[PDB]
């Protein structure tokens, strides 16, 4: 009924004698600069607006009530809050605010700021917030006590409010949450924006009198005096600037770079680990609201034309693994046949499900790697004909109208897109025309949010358990959240996610629910699976030291520090 730490599933790892995380050096020295790259551009400082392209790190301008550890899927520890009292079912919580908590101007962070902040999101925030927290109230019941009440049980929904940025009312009463900010807002975190050039760079400086520098959660972190982001229009120019020493650290997402271009003794450290944790996955989203992709058979046939084995062997040094789950590399992935609990959940909806949900394990198409896979292309032709798209001349045309089968692939100019022309060529050999349109970072963001595309690449970020966030990306009423990439409004999806959001905090029930959802999402071919790898490929100039232990769920760069003895050996 009163705790200092929370976890959505199970018990917090740091529930007892919590002085600092396992993955930090508590004695880490302060000072020095780390310079990072970002791709594309930015035009404002408000991560929470309805429009705009927010600057790098602008989702970390503010401290929150509790903050998550990085070696656990979802555990929360004191930051602005000291502790909380709560009901058994987590449907109400009273949070005690640290009386030392301060904004950057030295003014106190109070319960009224938290109440103001919740109402600000409810009335001027992204439209999914007021949908998720409809019926929730957040009330300052004392100068430093805030009471949160949910209209229905939602342990995760409660805990996720602990991650809300806490806004200073004295600043935000004069700015709509929905408007971009040309200038950084009054904030509170361990780093403050101190200079910038719109579209080019942002410099963060360490707040040397940060009120919380010595909380267990912050010990050994936030060590650099400044963090600089420099923007680059494409990744190849960024990679060449890295090797020239223009910034300090690179996460290598390109197989060819890693295989062939980390050359020149090279002083730069190269590091390949391996994360056994939940994985980000790449997909190509079918906009199923447009006629070209409304037939599941057409989406299946176009998926068959994507020859991953050829690409992996001929282009990518066999580095990649095929995406095949929305819960990739977790126990929630549907990699076995449905068990009895799953069939109880799925059989009621048998007539609105592909039959393969019950009889097969989902397997993205496999080719020989030779190119020109006969079996897969013949099957795509067979499916296209059945859906009414037939060859006249070289071009596939609708059987009744004669309209060509054609669509636009929308692409960020900034990415390496070696796979694109091989895919275009495969589709052309089926009589399908795919136009390629590369656009700038602000165009990509705007059109991705509005779903103004036929197809575009989308990253499905790691999801270690079936979180209530699933409804924002998949459920019918959240269709305009900007996270529903295919545009799907399905009562099958809705029913399974309604069950998932009613099983928050309950692993026993989420286990068959997540697998069941995985089957529905994969077997309907809403998106075309690309690839991932369970390796972190990193390189950095040798000016840093690191704790002995790396956190499970991030790279832990915020635990690194500037090593004056290593830096001294560099030019």
């Amino acid at each position: 009924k009163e705790s200092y730490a929370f976890a959505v599933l199970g018990e917090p790892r740091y529930a007892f004698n919590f002085n600092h995380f396992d993955y930090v050096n508590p004695a880490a020295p302060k000072g020095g600069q780390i310079t990072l790259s970002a791709l594309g551009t930015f035009d404002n400082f408000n991560r929470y607006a309805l429009r705009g392209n927010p600057g790098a790190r602008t989702e970390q301008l503010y401290d929150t009530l509790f903050t998550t550890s990085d070696d656990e899927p979802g555990s929360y520890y004191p930051l602005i809050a000291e502790s909380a009292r709560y009901a058994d079912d987590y449907s109400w919580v009273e949070v005690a605010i640290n009386p030392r908590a301060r904004f950057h101007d030295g003014s106190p962070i109070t319960a009224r700021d938290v109440e103001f902040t919740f109402q600000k999101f409810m009335t001027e925030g992204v439209p999914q917030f007021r949908l998720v927290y409809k019926g929730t109230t957040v009330k300052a019941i004392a100068p430093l006590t805030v009471r949160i009440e949910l209209a229905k049980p939602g342990k995760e929904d409660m805990l996720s409010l602990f991650s809300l940025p806490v806004f200073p009312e004295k600043y935000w009463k004069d700015h709509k949450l929905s408007d971009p900010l040309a200038t950084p807002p009054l904030a509170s975190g361990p780093y403050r924006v101190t200079s910038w050039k719109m579209g080019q760079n942002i410099v963060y400086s360490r707040v040397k009198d940060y009120w919380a520098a010595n909380l267990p959660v912050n010990r050994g972190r936030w060590n650099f005096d400044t963090i600089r982001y420099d923007y680059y229009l494409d990744d190849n120019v960024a990679f060449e600037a890295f090797k020239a020493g223009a910034f300090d650290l690179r996460m290598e997402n390109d197989a060819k770079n890693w295989a062939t271009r980390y050359t020149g003794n090279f002083y730069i450290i190269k590091d390949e680990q391996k994360n056994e944790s939940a994985q980000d996955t790449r997909w190509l989203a079918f906009n199923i609201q447009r006629p070209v992709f409304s037939d599941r058979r057409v989406r299946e046939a176009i998926t068959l034309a994507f020859d991953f084995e050829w690409m992996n062997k001929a282009l990518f040094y066999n580095a990649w693994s095929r995406t095949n789950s929305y819960f990739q590399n977790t126990e929630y992935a549907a990699r076995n046949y449905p068990d009895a609990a799953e069939l109880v959940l799925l059989a009621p909806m048998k007539k609105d499900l592909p039959s393969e949900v019950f009889t097969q394990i989902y397997q993205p198409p496999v080719s020989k790697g030779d190119g020109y896979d006969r079996d897969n292309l013949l099957k795509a032709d067979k499916l296209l004909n059945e859906a009414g798209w037939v060859l006249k001349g070289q071009q596939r045309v609708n059987a009744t109208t004669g309209q060509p089968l054609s669509f636009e692939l929308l692409l960020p100019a900034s990415s390496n897109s070696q796979w694109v022309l091989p895919f275009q060529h495969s589709l052309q050999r089926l009589g399908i025309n795919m136009d390629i349109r590369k656009v700038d970072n602000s165009q990509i963001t705007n059109r991705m949010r509005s779903r103004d595309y036929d197809m575009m690449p989308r990253v499905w970020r790691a999801m270690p358990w079936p979180s209530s966030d699933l409804q924002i990306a998949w459920s019918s009423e959240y269709i305009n959240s900007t996270y529903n990439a295919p545009g799907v409004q399905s009562p099958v999806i809705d029913s399974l996610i309604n069950q998932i959001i009613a099983a928050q905090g309950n692993k026993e029930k989420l286990l068959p629910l997540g697998r069941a959802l995985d089957r529905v999402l994969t077997w309907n071919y809403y998106m075309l699976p690309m690839w991932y790898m369970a390796e972190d490929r990193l390189a950095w100039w040798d000016k840093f030291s690191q704790p002995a232990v790396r956190p499970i769920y991030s790279l832990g760069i915020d635990t690194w520090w500037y090593d004056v003895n290593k830096a001294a050996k560099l030019p």
Partner: peptide
Amino acid sequence: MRTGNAX
């Protein structure tokens, strides 16, 4: 996803 638009 509840507090900001995709990037």
